[PDB]
Symmetry: C3
Subunit: 283 residues, 3 copies
């Protein structure tokens, strides 16, 4: 045996042949709304994304399918070509992410401590997800707090990356947008506020007072303004703080407290990161 996995089985049937669709809205991505649906055999809950059919959508779906095999990428189970209001659309059925957002979960931790080791485990997971994409020459280009979601409500749920609506084949810089995004997420993970305000990005006391240079040097190599200066995903995953995530110190962070204190500005933080990512895309 040699370990081929199935190609894109894009289906022509009406989805209602195979899935019961609902009007429960689960989310909105940058291309459109995400709806709940139920598999007509199993009753298992799934999520449906409606994309109006187009060459851009046909490429993006194919990239998400190629991404699907990675344990930290949201899996596609089915894709349909259907007619809706007489205009042709694509319906992507994905696995149900009832676990919510990465940082919203941390902000909802309350009592218990959020450690540098847990930040290392999360950042290893995110980096491991990007590593698969870059190794097959796919760049995500919209890695951000809205797009990192958990599979279940338990503490040991597994984090998966979402919304390939900006993804791009690097075949002949686009890959550097993911590495910048990883540095921003890692910064927010370690103190609860972002490295931007609209005169440097600071490392303010007290939150950073005991934080190592080892992480801060790792941050400095990710947040370079020039894309050519940023470390690659390969170099990131080989850093000891990432590679040896079990051995990382259990250092308590301020992150949860600060995210609660700044909760009224958190929507703005996510919006200006989206604006920064859009600026790096219209490049």
């Amino acid at each position: 045996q040699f370990h081929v996995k199935s190609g894109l089985q894009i289906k022509k049937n009406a989805i209602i042949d195979d899935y019961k669709v609902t009007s429960q809205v689960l989310g909105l991505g940058i291309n459109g709304k995400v709806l709940q649906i139920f598999n007509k055999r199993t009753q298992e809950k799934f999520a449906l994304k409606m994309l109006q059919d187009c060459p851009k959508a046909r490429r993006e779906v194919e990239l998400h399918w190629r991404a699907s095999q990675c344990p930290h990428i949201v899996r596609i189970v089915d894709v349909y070509e259907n007619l809706y209001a007489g205009r042709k659309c694509l319906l992507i059925v994905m696995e149900c992410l009832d676990g919510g957002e990465l940082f919203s979960r941390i902000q909802d931790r309350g009592d218990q401590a959020f450690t540098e080791r847990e930040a290392s485990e999360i950042m290893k997971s995110i980096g491991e997800a990007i590593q698969y994409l870059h190794s097959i020459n796919i760049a995500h280009r919209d890695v951000k707090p809205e797009n990192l979601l958990y599979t279940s409500k338990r503490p040991n749920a597994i984090l998966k990356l979402t919304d390939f609506g900006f993804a791009k084949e690097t075949t002949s810089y686009d890959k550097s947008c993911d590495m910048w995004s990883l540095g921003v997420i890692m910064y927010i993970l370690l103190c609860g506020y972002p490295p931007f305000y609209s005169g440097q990005y600071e490392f303010p006391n007290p939150e950073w007072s005991e934080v190592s240079e080892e992480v801060k040097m790792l941050i400095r190599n990710l947040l370079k303004t020039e894309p050519t200066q940023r470390m690659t995903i390969t170099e990131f995953m080989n850093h000891p703080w990432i590679m040896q995530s079990t051995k990382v110190p259990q250092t308590p962070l301020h992150t949860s407290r600060v995210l609660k204190e700044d909760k009224e500005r958190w929507e703005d933080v996510k919006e200006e990161m989206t604006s920064a990512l859009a600026t790096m895309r219209v490049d």
Copy 2:
């Protein structure tokens, strides 16, 4: 439930797996010949159009499929990708239109009266067909006497529009060609001769002697030389003569008599309308 309808199930099998094909010719459209065939389960008679496979054909078929749902558009039941003389072709199976042409049927009415109310019912049907196409941003661009056919030999048969071989997506004027065509059909419906000879388009006595300004104003807004002046299909369907077609006066027309008198020139009338439409397309 939400009312999705099935996407283009283009089939790879040999059509003879599914349909018995015959050598009975039913017609010729602008792209090619139309043949009789029989569904191998049901024995129901259908019509087969052979299009040599091409990107232009692949788009046009998709537009005809999107059009198919409208009650006044000829339905596609199946589409096949086959090999013929070693060169790849597309076979479109459509519903059987044994009812013949719109004006040929009127010309064959003989005895009984053809009324302005019946012209309003026909023009409502044609306008209702175009309205669906324009509302999904499809323009037909070849609406003409050859392309409006009836489902059955009875008087109350339903009229359907045919031959998407010039149709075009208006997505970024093409839509105005259908509105010009509707005005020409409406003119011929009301007197039996066209508004062209090769010094105005007339409204000659006696045939127009009792014909209202309400229709003639409606005609004047459709036959404008500049496309930007023509009424839209929306404005046409809202005209009282169209909207209130049951209330339209039962005025007897000269149409059938004139079509019989001018039958020797009717082929030329259809040919010069095709030439006028081709001129408006090479635009």
Copy 3:
């Protein structure tokens, strides 16, 4: 009935659903390696070509499928779209050519005579293969000793043409490359060495001493430097030496002896023909 044959049934499933794949290598073509596999129902041996998925591959496969029906073209049985190392590839399953190369078989004849009539039968077979391709406006563009293979180890096995990795639709010179290739093969068939060295192409004594002008005139019309001077495949197949291949004289050739004597340079002969064909392609 009208004799449609099935279109390209390109399949989405994992090939291992349908075929047991092996690590036995059968060959390498210009695009990639050819592997042995077994049909999971029948156990019949087949050959698998892995092409990384691309528009160029999607066209070439379609051309090979259209070619497939000809008895002297290697048949495709199935085509799959699969994922491999997370990158999308195409797997072409072809009929098993255990019979080896055209000239390698002749070189391995040893004892028995190789006749001008047998050279006429081989050249009729090759010309008959090209005739199908040109009649559907496909040019092969890499007809050469590596690409002409036999279906079985018996003397009366049937010769088939292979490797459509350079084939091209002539739709608007490319067709002339096949005719040049046929002339080179015919030359080598008749004496055992090629008409090139890197000052004319000779007809040396003794091998050509009794060879007719009828073949040599046929050769002269195929090896013209200017493509516009070469005979077409139609004119070739109408030549009496080809058309009347059963009536061709049983003249004994030197070919097998010379191929054995020059066996140490035969790999170079095939390589410089490939280089000449590449030069005629980068045109």
